[PDB]
Design a protein around this ligand. Structure first.
Ligand SMILES: CCCCCCCC/C=C\CCCCCCCC(=O)O[C@@H](COC(=O)CCCCCCCCCCCCCCC)COP(=O)([O-])OCC[N+](C)(C)C
Ligand SMILES: CCCCCCCC/C=C/CCCCCCCC(=O)OC[C@H](O)CO
Ligand SMILES: CCCCCCCC/C=C/CCCCCCCC(=O)OC[C@H](O)CO
Ligand SMILES: CCCCCCCC/C=C\CCCCCCCC(=O)OC[C@H](O)CO
Ligand SMILES: CCCCCCCCCCCCCCCC(=O)O
Ligand SMILES: CCCCCCCCCCCCCCCC(=O)O
Lengths: 228, 98, 177, 49, 98, 49
């Protein structure tokens, strides 16, 4: 619930408060206050843990020191309890990889693409620094990070305990994200923008009618109904 | 000056024509008014013959291609979301009194 | 056991002063990941110079740019001029000077109290300096051995102050006899 | 040329969230030391001579 | 050992910080004042901790915008397009649910 | 009194219920035991709430 720095500075403040209470309580010959250095440390510790006092400073200055230590203790313990309540109430799990930049800057999580496909070619030819860095890694990674089929990549993600991320088209990713056991997730935005097309041999007689049909099915909303 | 100013000079040199840049009067890209059916913006300037060519971030769309001609794309793009960043807040010094 | 107490307090004063001075002068306070002299590479940033390493031109480094709501302006000013770490160094120096002068002009047994007060105040200034440093850094990372040299100087300064006050109490106890 | 060559651009509680309470604590320790020394100087000057 | 003005102030301060007492009132009137101040302290410090927990818990379950699906499922963040353009037309004609 | 077995059980119970002390250990070993018990109590009661 508290940052490492808060704990470290709590310990420094404990030592400082104990030493200043010992100094102020017993330094003037006219006071000669049962606060020796050991008893000062005990008083400060027991004040921090909101525990018994058994001795309280009687001087004005020892009382100033005690009062500010008491205020500090109240605020710090209240804030520890509050932040622990916050942690327990709303749990949140962190996804190691947020974007492709994330994959490129690390090596604990392996990542690859379909062994043969437009995704692999996107990386092999990218002139974008992050993607070129990812290609440099993927093409030389051993064992191979490439897979023969999409299903193989999905299974490698599912069986690698989070040590394998898979680069694939958003369409396939969105579909698998809606499939049991619901253990995969699409993270970040898309790395590029492109489209699927109906392909015919160069110069095919079917080229014009099939291009027009795709546009008709597009314009009448058939393609959205079929994706849904 | 700008990307399209640089591109206009080059299109004109490679096509061999002299040209005059004019800013579209209504400051719009181009839509067909549902009602008056009139085309506004840069598309309108071409449809009604006020301009001979449009060199701008004009999106190739089916409805526009039905009334004007477009070259192959000179830029690829898509609709995106623009948000104000999150701007991490710096807590006040005496914020324990909040 | 007087006599060995004086040696222990003098050694402690010198150790605290040396550690705090090395901490301020050295620049390994924070192992961040940022830009070296004007690609993101690691850096051994310090109180004054954010210095580079594991880079194209590692070892070449510059002066941290402290500045890019008066509260932020005041904190940035206090963290730009390391007034609190430097004040800790000055107070440890004056405490050591008082301890040294406790041999000459002896029998005052009122300057060794001043030595204790100086060491305690040096510790308090040191902790304020650490707090402002960490708070300003919040405007992955780690802390270097310069940071821990400052912290260890704080601990040794507080112990030496407790010894000095103990010796002052013992001296007035002997005088009252 | 026109986009990039001329481009102009935790869960735990942090020490910043509570730094004020540390400042108050150390200020109070300093004030306590000042008050103690003022009283000691007063008494040390109040001895009949 | 008895409640003068300075000792009265110290007792009150220590009772507020829940930091125990080196001495407590012994008379009926002193005990009424002490009991009532103890009740006040209990309610105020419990309420401070509870409201700090509310602040942190509420600030922890906030979430930003990461997609068009996100914009569609919420209403606190408004969103729009150029009043005349290919973006506005993309949405006016989309047959995609989101 | 000093910590016999019954008084030590009473000290520990009162420490856990955060109900302060009537006695507290005075020796270094007693104080180490009391310190770790106080830390344990603080973490457990805070975690319960
Ligand atoms: C009787 C018992 C004795 C008790 C003794 C009480 C003593 C009270 C001391 C309090 C010190 C205040 C310091 C300060 O103003 O902080 C400044 C930071 O600037 C710094 O970084 C502060 C520098 C270190 C302070 C050293 C002491 C900012 O403070 P601000 O501008 O005032 O805050 C308003 C705006 N804000 C909340 C957004 C920040
Ligand atoms: C006899 C008793 C001896 C004395 C015992 C003293 C101990 C009590 C101190 C408490 C903290 C006091 C300081 C409270 C902090 C004030 C800060 C503040 O007011 O912040 C303003 C803010 O910026 C919005 O205006
Ligand atoms: C005067 C007599 C003195 C009495 C003494 C009583 C002791 C009270 C404190 C106990 C807890 C201290 C131990 C804290 C241990 C912290 C654990 C740690 O170091 O964290 C591990 C790591 O940093 C993260 O992975
Ligand atoms: C032995 C001597 C001890 C002396 C005694 C010390 C005081 C006791 C402490 C707190 C009293 C709290 C009083 C609570 C008053 C409650 C008011 C109330 O209940 O009104 C709400 C209403 O019913 C809704 O409709
Ligand atoms: C009153 C003085 C002592 C109170 C007990 C405080 C415990 C101190 C712990 C210090 C180290 C904490 C390390 C946590 C950070 C991490 O887990 O990485
Ligand atoms: C506000 C509260 C009142 C502040 C103090 C007023 C001064 C009255 C004179 C008291 C003299 C000190 C006597 C004592 O210690 O009991």
């Amino acid at each position: 619930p508290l940052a490492y720095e808060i704990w470290m500075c709590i310990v420094f403040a404990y030592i400082g408060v104990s030493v200043v209470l010992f100094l102020v309580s017993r330094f003037s010959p006219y006071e000669w206050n049962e606060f020796g250095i050991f008893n000062s440390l005990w008083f400060s510790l027991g004040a921090f843990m909101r525990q018994g006092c058994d001795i309280s400073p009687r001087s004005l200055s020892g009382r100033i020191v005690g009062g500010v230590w008491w205020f500090f203790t109240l605020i710090i313990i209240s804030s520890y309890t509050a932040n622990l309540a916050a942690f327990l109430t709303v749990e949140r799990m962190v996804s190691p990889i947020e974007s492709a930049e994330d994959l490129s800057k690390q090596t604990e999580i392996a990542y690859g693409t379909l062994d043969s496909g437009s995704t692999k070619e996107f990386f092999r030819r990218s002139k974008i620094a992050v993607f070129d860095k990812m290609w440099t890694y993927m093409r030389s990674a051993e064992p191979s990070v490439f897979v023969r089929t999409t299903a193989e990549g999905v299974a490698r993600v599912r069986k690698s305990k989070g040590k394998y991320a898979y680069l694939l088209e958003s369409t396939m990713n969105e579909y698998i994200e809606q499939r049991k056991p619901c253990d995969t997730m699409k993270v970040g935005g898309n790395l590029d923008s492109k489209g699927y097309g109906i392909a015919t041999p160069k110069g095919s007689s079917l080229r014009t009618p099939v291009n027009l049909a795709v546009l008709k099915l597009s314009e009448q909303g058939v393609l959205d109904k079929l994706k849904n | 000056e700008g990307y399209c100013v640089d591109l206009a000079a080059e299109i004109a040199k490679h096509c061999g024509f002299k040209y005059k840049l004019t800013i579209v009067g209504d400051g719009k890209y181009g839509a067909r008014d549902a009602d008056t059916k009139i085309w506004n913006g840069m598309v309108g300037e071409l449809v009604y013959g006020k301009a001979d060519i449009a060199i701008a971030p004009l999106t190739i769309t089916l409805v526009r291609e039905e009334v004007i001609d477009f070259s192959k794309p000179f830029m690829s793009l898509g609709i995106s979301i623009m948000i104000k960043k999150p701007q991490k807040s710096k807590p006040g010094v005496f914020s324990f009194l909040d | 056991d007087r006599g060995v107490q004086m040696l222990l307090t003098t050694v402690g004063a010198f150790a605290a002063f040396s550690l705090m001075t090395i901490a301020v002068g050295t620049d390994y306070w924070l192992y961040s990941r940022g830009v070296c002299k004007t690609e993101e590479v690691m850096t051994h940033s310090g109180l004054w110079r954010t210095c580079c390493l594991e880079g194209n031109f590692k070892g070449l480094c510059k002066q941290i740019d402290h500045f890019p709501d008066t509260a932020e302006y005041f904190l940035r000013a206090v963290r730009a001029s390391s007034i609190f770490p430097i004040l800790s160094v000055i107070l440890l120096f004056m405490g050591g000077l008082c301890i040294a002068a406790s041999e000459f002009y002896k029998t005052r047994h009122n300057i060794i109290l001043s030595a204790g007060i100086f060491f305690v105040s040096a510790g308090l200034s040191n902790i304020i300096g650490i707090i402002v440093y960490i708070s300003a850094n919040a405007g992955s990372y780690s802390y270097g051995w310069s940071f821990y040299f400052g912290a260890l100087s704080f601990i040794i300064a507080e112990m030496v102050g407790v010894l000095a006050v103990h010796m002052f109490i013992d001296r007035h106890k002997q005088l009252r006899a | 040329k026109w986009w990039y060559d001329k481009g102009e651009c935790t869960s735990a509680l942090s020490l910043s969230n509570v730094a004020g309470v540390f400042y108050i604590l150390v200020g109070g320790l300093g004030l306590a030391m000042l008050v103690a020394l003022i009283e000691f100087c007063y008494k040390s000057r109040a001895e009949a001579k």
